[PDB]
Amino acid sequence: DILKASATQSAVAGTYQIQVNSLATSSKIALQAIADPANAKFNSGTLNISVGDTKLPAITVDSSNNTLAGMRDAINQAGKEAGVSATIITDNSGSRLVLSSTKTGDGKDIKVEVSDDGSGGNTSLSQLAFDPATAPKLSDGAAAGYVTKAANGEITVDGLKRSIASNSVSDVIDGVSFDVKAVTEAGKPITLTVSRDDAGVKDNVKKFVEAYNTLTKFINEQTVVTKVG
Amino acid sequence: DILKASATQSAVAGTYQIQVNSLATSSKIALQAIADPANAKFNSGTLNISVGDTKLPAITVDSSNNTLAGMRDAINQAGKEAGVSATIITDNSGSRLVLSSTKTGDGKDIKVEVSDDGSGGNTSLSQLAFDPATAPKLSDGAAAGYVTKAANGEITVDGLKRSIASNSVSDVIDGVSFDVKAVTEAGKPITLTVSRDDAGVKDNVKKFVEAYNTLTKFINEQTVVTKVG
Amino acid sequence: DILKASATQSAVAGTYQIQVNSLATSSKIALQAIADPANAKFNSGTLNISVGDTKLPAITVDSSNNTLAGMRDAINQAGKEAGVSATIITDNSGSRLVLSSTKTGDGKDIKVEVSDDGSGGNTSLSQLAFDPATAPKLSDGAAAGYVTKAANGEITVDGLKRSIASNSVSDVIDGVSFDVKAVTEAGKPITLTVSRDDAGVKDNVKKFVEAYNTLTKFINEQTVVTKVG
Amino acid sequence: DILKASATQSAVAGTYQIQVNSLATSSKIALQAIADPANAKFNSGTLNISVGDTKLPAITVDSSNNTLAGMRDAINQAGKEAGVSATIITDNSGSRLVLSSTKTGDGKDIKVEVSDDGSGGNTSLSQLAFDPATAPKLSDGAAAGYVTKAANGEITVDGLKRSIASNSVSDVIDGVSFDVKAVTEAGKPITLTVSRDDAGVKDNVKKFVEAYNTLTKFINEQTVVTKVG
Amino acid sequence: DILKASATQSAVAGTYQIQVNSLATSSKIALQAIADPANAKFNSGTLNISVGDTKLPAITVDSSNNTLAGMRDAINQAGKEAGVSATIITDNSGSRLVLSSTKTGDGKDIKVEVSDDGSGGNTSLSQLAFDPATAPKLSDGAAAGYVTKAANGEITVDGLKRSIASNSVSDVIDGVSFDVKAVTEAGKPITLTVSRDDAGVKDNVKKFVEAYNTLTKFINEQTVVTKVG
Ligand code: NA
Ligand code: NA
Ligand code: NA
Ligand code: NA
Ligand code: NA
Ligand code: NA
Ligand code: NA
Ligand code: NA
Ligand code: NA
C-alpha cells in the first residue's frame, strides 16, 4: 500500500510483523557558490569525482569548459555510467553546481578532489572541492554542503533488524521481495501476509473445463458440419 | 431447414442435389360404424390385430369389455408395444374404432382378424374385421376404410432414387443422417453441402492458447500471493 | 458483390463491362452400384485412378480392403495429393463409390482403370472401371455415370471472351484478380470500376500530420515534466 | 439529384425543362491480340499516338521495351499529359494493348500510327496500328476495334438543343453550371428551378442582429469586471 | 393540401366541390439565336419592351451595351418594375435572349419592338423583335418563339366556372381565399369545408377561466407575503 509493496517467488505461507525505521538514501551535494557566474572562469586543472569505491573519469579543465555550465556538461557526461548527474542552482550567493547520485547505501557519498593549476581563470578551481568526511549539511550561504547523505535504511521483521542498502530488497524473507516506500509510525508495524495458498488452481481447472469442453464442440461434434444451400 | 434437417458423423466434403418426391407413411384405418353405439354390446369372440410382421396379443372379448370404449381400452394396452393406438369417432353413421400405427414403410398396414362366437350381445363382432388387401380409402358412410396407407417414401440424390422406410434415414450418403420433413417442388431441388474443416483446427485451437496462457497467472504468478495490512 | 469479387495489385484506372457465361467445373463421378453391398467382397486386382495429367498411386486390392468401405478408405488416402475424395451412396440399386476431384478445367476428368484377377471375392472388380470418354451423365439405375463434367468457364470483358480453367482468375485484366461466383443474366452485364487514387494521397497523409503534431507534446513539451507535493 | 447536379454564380430567377438525350464520351480502343504473348517480342520501330489535336511524344521501340508490358509502361508515361493510359487484356486470342483517353467530345479518338523496321523480334510492330476512321466497334476475336467512341453529348433546354463536349458544362444557361450524370427518360423531362433570394437577406441578417447584440455584454458590460473574495 | 391551400376572413359554413382545370400562366419568350455571340455587336437603335398594358422604359442601344450581355443587364434593370427579367441561353444555334414576366393572366404577353438604325455593329438589331400575335411556340432552331403563354387559369365551384388571372384568388367564394397549386384529376374533385365554430367559444374561453383563476393567488393571496428567518 503506502508503506510497502511486496511480491513472492516460491516461499512458504506465513505472517510477519514489519517495521520500517528508515529508508535507504542516496547522495546529493552542493558545491561552493560562485559569485558573478556569467563572467567567472575556472583555473585549468583536473576534477576527480568519486562515489564510494567507484571513480568517475578524471575531468580535465581547460578553456573549452572552465565555466559552471561547462562543468555541468562535463560532469553529466562523465557520470552517466555511475548515475551521477549535475545541475545549477542560483541563489543569493551566486550560482553553484548540484550533484546527485542514484546509488543508495552507506558510504556512497559524492566526493570531489581537485587539482588546480593555479592559473587559467579569475576564480580558483580548488573551491569546487568537496570532502564528505568534513562537509556539513547544506545551509544558506556560499559555502558547500551535502543535501542528503548516502545511507542504509533499516527494517525489522518479527523483531529482527535488517540494514538495507536499497529500498528494493529481496530474500530478507526467503522468496519474498518488497519495495520499502515509507517509514512506519512508532510501534505501529505492518502485518505482512504471505499466502502460499490460492485455491485458484480452480483457474487451472478451467483448462480441462475448456480443454475438454472446447474440444467437444469444434472436435467430435462439429468436425464435420452440414446444412442446405 | 424446412424440408430436411441433416447431421454428420465423420464423412467427406461434397455437394449434393436432393429431391424429395414423397414421405414414408404409417397405417391409419377406420372400422365399421356401429349404429346406436350407446346401447351396443359386442358378441363374444377374439380380436387378432397385426401390423405386417408384428402380431398383437390375442384380445378376448367378454362381458367386461364388449363395448366400443371397452375395445378402445384393450387395444390401447394390447398395442403399446408395436405403436398401435385406438380411439372412437362419432359421425352421422354412429361411432367406430379408429386405429393408428407408428411404423412407417411399405406393408406395415394394420390388420384386424375376427372370430365371432355369434352370441354375447346385440351387434356382430365380425364387422370389426379389416383386410388391408381389400379395404378402400375411407369415405363417408358406415363402411370401413383406411385413412392413410403405410408406405415407403422416396428421395433422389444427384439423380439416384432411394426408397425410404422412414423419414429419418441414415447412410444413404455415407456418414450423413437427415430427417426429411417435406417434399421439394417439382424441378426445384435442394443443394446439400457437407463441410469438414472451417477455422480448422484454429477455432478450438484458441482454447489451448488460453488454457496455456491462463496457466501463467493463477499458476506460477499467483502460486504464492502477498498482502499487507 | 454476389457475382464477382475483385482485387488489385497496382494497375491503371478504367471501366469494364463483364459477362459471366459459365463457371469452371471439377469432376464428380459415380461408379456402378453393387448389389447386396453388405456381403459383397471384391475380386483381387489393381485400381489405377487418374485425373488428366495427374496419376494416383496404384491401388492394390487384397483381403484387407476388398470392400466398398475398404476402397473408400484407400482412395481417400490414395488421393489426398490430387484432391480426389470418395464416399458411398446407397440407392435402390445398392451402394456405389462416388468420387470427386477439386481440379477445375477442361479435361480434368476422373478416370478409373481396372485390372481384375477374376478371383478373390463374389463381385467383379472390373465393374468399377470408368472411362470419361464413354461415360454418360449419371441417371437413376445401377449403371455408372458422371455427376459433373470438369470444364473451363467463360467470361467476356468488353466483348472479348476468355475461357477460364478456374473460378479464381488473374491478369485477364492486367493487375486485377477476381473470383467469379455466379453467372450474369443474359444481356445484363456487370460494370467493373478500377479506381486508383481517391483522397490520394491525403487520406494516409492525415497520419504524418499527426505523427508530426503528436511529436510536439510528449516529445519537446513533455520531455521534462514537473510536479509539486 | 441523380441525373444532374447544378450550381450557380449570380444569375436570374427562372424555370427550365431539361432533357438529357446522351452523354459526352471519351475514346477507348483495343489493339490486335498478340498470339503467345509470353514469348512475343516486337520488331524495331516507332509509335506515334495522338488523340485529335494532341500528339504524344514519339515512342521508340527498342530492345528495352519491345514487349506488351514494355509498351504499356511507355504509353502510361508517354501519355500522362493528354490523359492516355494503357493496360493489357488477356482473352482467348492472346494478350492485347487497351488504351483509354480522358478527353470527352467529338473527334477526340485515340489514333496509333506505326513505322515498322521489319526486324527486331518475332511479331510485327505494324499490327499495333489503329485508324479510328476505319476501325469497327470491338467484337470477340484477335482483330482490333474501339470500345467507346469519343463523342459530344446532347441536352435540350425548353426545346433548344445543345451539343456538349463534356458532361460538365457551363453557361448554357447564363451563370448556371451543372454536371450531367444521366439520361432522362423519353418524354420525362427534369424541372430545374433557379432561386435567387429566399429568407433574403434575413437569413444572414440574423448575424448582425447578434454580432451587434453580442457586443453589448462582453463589450460595454464586461469591459470592466468585479469580484470579491 | 397539395392542390389548393385555403384561408378565411369571416364567412359562413358550407361545403364545396372544386375542380382545377388549369393554372394561370405568365409569359416567357426566347428571341432569335445570334450566330457567333462571342464577337457579335448590335446595330444602333431602340428597344421598346411591353407586357400588355405596362410599357418598359425605352432602351437605347449604343456602344456601351450593344452586346447580348449588354442587353441582358439593361432589360434586368429596365424591367424591375413590371417583373421582366432576362438571361442568355447558349444552344447549337448560338446565344439568345430569354425574357420572363411574373404577371399571370390572359394578354400579359411580353412584346419586343425594334427600331434599327441599320448600323453600329455586325448583327441586325431588328432580329430581336417579337410579336406575340405571330410568334410560334419555341422549338429547336435559331428562330424565336414563346416558351409559355400568359393566360388565365380555370376552376369550377359546384359546377360553376371561374376564369382566374392568378393562382392566388379571393372572394370567388365570399370571404375565402385559396392559392391554387395544382390541377385536379379528371372527375376527381376536391371537397372544401368551411368550418366556423368548433370548441366555440370554449377553446379560447379556457383562458379567462385561468386569467380569472390566476388572479386569485399572485393577486389577493400573494399581494402580501410573509417569511421567517
Ligand atoms: Na552555505
Ligand atoms: Na369407406
Ligand atoms: Na365409409
Ligand atoms: Na447412369
Ligand atoms: Na445409372
Ligand atoms: Na473487333
Ligand atoms: Na476483334
Ligand atoms: Na421557334
Ligand atoms: Na426556334
Numbering used by the authors:
A (entry chain A), B (entry chain B), C (entry chain B), D (entry chain B), E (entry chain B): 80 to 308
Authors' description from the paper:
Flagella are helix-shaped hollow attachments formed predominantly by thousands of copies of the protein flagellin (also called FliC), anchored in the bacterial membrane by a hook (or joint) that is attached to the basal body and that is composed of rotary motor proteins. A FliD (also called HAP2) oligomer forms the cap protein complex that is located at the tip of the flagellar filament. This complex controls the distal growth of the filament by regulating the assembly of FliC molecules, which are transported through the hollow filament from the cytoplasm to the tip of the flagellum. Flagellum-mediated motility is crucial for the virulence and pathogenicity of numerous bacteria, including Campylobacter jejuni, Salmonella, Escherichia coli, Vibrio cholera, and Pseudomonas aeruginosa, as well as the major causative agent of gastric cancer Helicobacter pylori.
We improved initially weakly diffracting crystals of FliD78–405 by random matrix microseed screening, yielding crystals that diffracted to 2.2 Å resolution. Our crystal structure of FliD78–405 reveals that it consists of two discreet regions with distinct conformational properties, corresponding to a stable head region and a flexible and/or disordered leg region. Residues 80–101 form two β strands that belong to the first domain (Head 1), the second domain (Head 2) is formed in its entirety by the contiguous residues 104–230, and residues 231–273 then complete the first domain. Despite this, we were able to model the initial α helical structural element, corresponding to residues 274–308, of this region. This helix extends from the axis of the head region at a nearly perpendicular angle, resulting in an L-shaped monomer subunit structure. In the crystal, FliD78–405 monomer subunits are arranged in hexamers, resulting in a shape akin to a six-pointed star when viewed from the top of the FliD oligomer, which corresponds to the distal end of the growing flagellum. When viewed from the side, the FliD hexamer appears as a six-legged stool, the legs of which extend 55 Å below the bottom of the head region. The leg-to-leg stacking forms dodecamers, resulting from the helix–helix interaction of the residues 274–302 of stacked molecules and the interaction of residues 303–308 of one FliD78–405 molecule with Head 1 domain of a stacked molecule, burying a surface area of 1362 Å2. Although the FliD78–405 crystal structure exhibits intermolecular contacts between the head regions of FliD78–405 subunits comprising the hexamer, each of these interfaces is small, with a buried surface area of only 665 Å2, and contains few intermolecular contacts relative to typical protein–protein interactions. Second, despite vanishingly low sequence similarity, each domain within the head region exhibits high structural similarity to the corresponding domains of other flagellar proteins, including the hook-filament junction protein/FlgK and flagellin/FliC.
